[PDB]
Paper text:
RING family ubiquitin ligases (E3s) employ the RING domain to recruit the E2 thioester ubiquitin (E2∼Ub) intermediate to catalyze the transfer of ubiquitin (Ub) to substrates. A cationic Arg linchpin (LP) residue in the RING domain plays a key role in stabilizing the interface with E2∼Ub, but the identity of the LP residue varies across E3s. Notably, the position of a cationic Arg residue in the RING domain is conserved in most structures of RING E3/E2∼UbD complexes, where the Arg side chain forms a network of hydrogen bonds with UbD and E2 to stabilize the closed E2∼UbD conformation. We chose the RING domain of RNF38 to use as a model monomeric RING with a native LPArg.
Having determined the crystal structure of RNF38RING alone to elucidate the position of Arg454, we subsequently attempted to crystallize a subset of RNF38RING LP variants, namely, R454Y, R454K, R454D, R454N, R454W, and R454M in complex with UBE2D2S22R,C85K−Ub. The RNF38RING-R454Y/UBE2D2S22R,C85K−Ub complex diffracted to 2.6 Å. In the RNF38RING-R454Y/UBE2D2S22R,C85K−Ub complex, RNF38RING-R454Y/UBE2D2 interaction is preserved as observed in the prior structure of the RNF38RING/UBE2D2S22R,C85K−Ub complex. In contrast, UbD is not in the closed conformation but rather oriented away from RNF38RING-R454Y. Analysis of crystal contacts showed that the Arg42 surface of UbD packs against the Tyr399, Gln407, and Glu434 regions of RNF38 in the asymmetric unit. Therefore, this could represent an extremely weak site for Ub with Kd in the hundreds of micromolar range or higher and the contacts observed in the crystals are likely due to crystal packing akin to those reported for RNF38RING/UBE2K−Ub/K48-Ub2. (A) There are two copies of the RNF38R454Y/UBE2D2S22R,C85K−Ub complex in the asymmetric unit, with no discernible structural differences between either RNF38R454Y (magenta) or the E2s. The electron density for one of the Ub molecules (salmon) is markedly better for one of the two copies—the poorer copy is missing loops with only the core interpretable, so we focused our analysis on the better copy. Although the C-terminal helix of UBE2D2 shifts by 2 Å, the contacts between UBE2D2 and RNF38 are similarly maintained in the structure of the mutant complex, whereas the conformation of UbD varies greatly. Therefore, the reduced activity of RNF38RING-R454Y in ubiquitination is explained by the suboptimal positioning of UbD, as revealed by both NMR and crystallography.
Numbering used by the authors:
A (entry chain A): 2 to 147
B (entry chain F): 0 to 76
C (entry chain C): 390 to 458
């Protein structure tokens, strides 16, 4: 598994995701940290969000376990940083890379999946009163991620 | 002058008559005749080798009743 | 399963350009000469050994998410 973790690390260097950084924290290659800048033209614009990335022993046959460390107001992300994303659990494939996951997360922030939510109350605001949904998200971006 | 099998597609079957001297590119056209597949859609594989369109059944050493493997490429998988 | 032995395999030869798959997406390694390649029903091929492990637990083409039994 090591060999493929290193492969991805170069792939990130040659084609870095838009305003995103990721890599191992220390000598252990299986534990990385990542940062994502809140997408422009989203409620999160201007925020910096930190993530943990943990590669399973038999990666890439098991997907990586990814989670936020920064609090975020979002229908698919909970107060524990858990992320409701399909590629991370049941649509996982060896063909997927760390870059693709980061870009999926990045697009999830732009466009939640309120029909299959992780936080009902915020999903319900997103569909029915989007204007309130963004102000709160902007507020949270301003408060814990700046 | 020789029986050959190309049972593949998962809907496998097909029995063909051929001469050892037949080039692979004759084979793909006879598969177009038993089946509707355009030849350029066809990828023939045998004993661990792709078969080159120009080479023949004798070249590759396909003996009677050899049962061979067809793979269908698509217009944009 | 036994199904994994019912799919075609063929040692890669760089000289002949019949498929446009120059890479095994599970290993992220170019196809090297004589390496064993396994092709799935959907005409997607990877390193045989490399994709073999994935079929034990799953049954979908890693690239296009198509079943392969
Ligand atoms: Zn490989
Ligand atoms: Zn496929």
């Amino acid at each position: 598994a090591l060999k493929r973790i290193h492969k991805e690390l170069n792939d990130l260097a040659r084609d870095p995701p838009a305003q995103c950084r990721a890599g191992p924290v220390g000598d252990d290659m299986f534990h990385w940290q990542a940062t994502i800048m809140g997408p422009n033209d989203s409620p999160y614009q201007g925020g910096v969000f930190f993530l943990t990335i943990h590669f399973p022993t038999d990666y890439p046959f098991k997907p990586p376990k990814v989670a936020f460390t920064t609090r975020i107001y979002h229908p698919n992300i909970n107060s524990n940083g858990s992320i409701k994303l399909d590629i991370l659990r049941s649509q996982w494939s060896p063909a997927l890379t760390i870059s693709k996951v980061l870009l999926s997360i990045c697009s999830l922030l732009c466009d939640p999946n309120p029909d299959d939510p992780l936080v009902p109350e915020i999903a319900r605001i997103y569909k029915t009163d989007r204007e309130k949904y963004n102000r709160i998200a902007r507020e949270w971006t301003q408060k814990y991620a700046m | 002058s020789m029986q050959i099998f190309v049972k593949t597609l998962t809907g496998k079957t097909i029995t063909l008559e051929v001469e050892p001297s037949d080039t692979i590119e004759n084979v793909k056209a006879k598969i177009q005749d038993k089946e509707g597949i355009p030849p350029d859609q066809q990828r023939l594989i045998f004993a661990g080798k792709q078969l080159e369109d120009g080479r023949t059944l004798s070249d590759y050493n396909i003996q009677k009743e050899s049962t061979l493997h067809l793979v269908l490429r698509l217009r944009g998988g | 399963k036994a199904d994994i032995e019912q799919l075609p395999s063929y040692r890669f030869n760089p000289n002949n350009h019949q498929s446009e798959q120059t890479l095994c997406v599970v290993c992220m390694c170019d196809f090297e000469s004589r390496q064993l390649l396994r092709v799935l029903p959907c005409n997607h091929e990877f390193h045989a050994k490399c994709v073999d492990k994935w079929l034990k637990a799953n049954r979908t083409c890693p690239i296009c998410y198509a079943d392969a039994s």
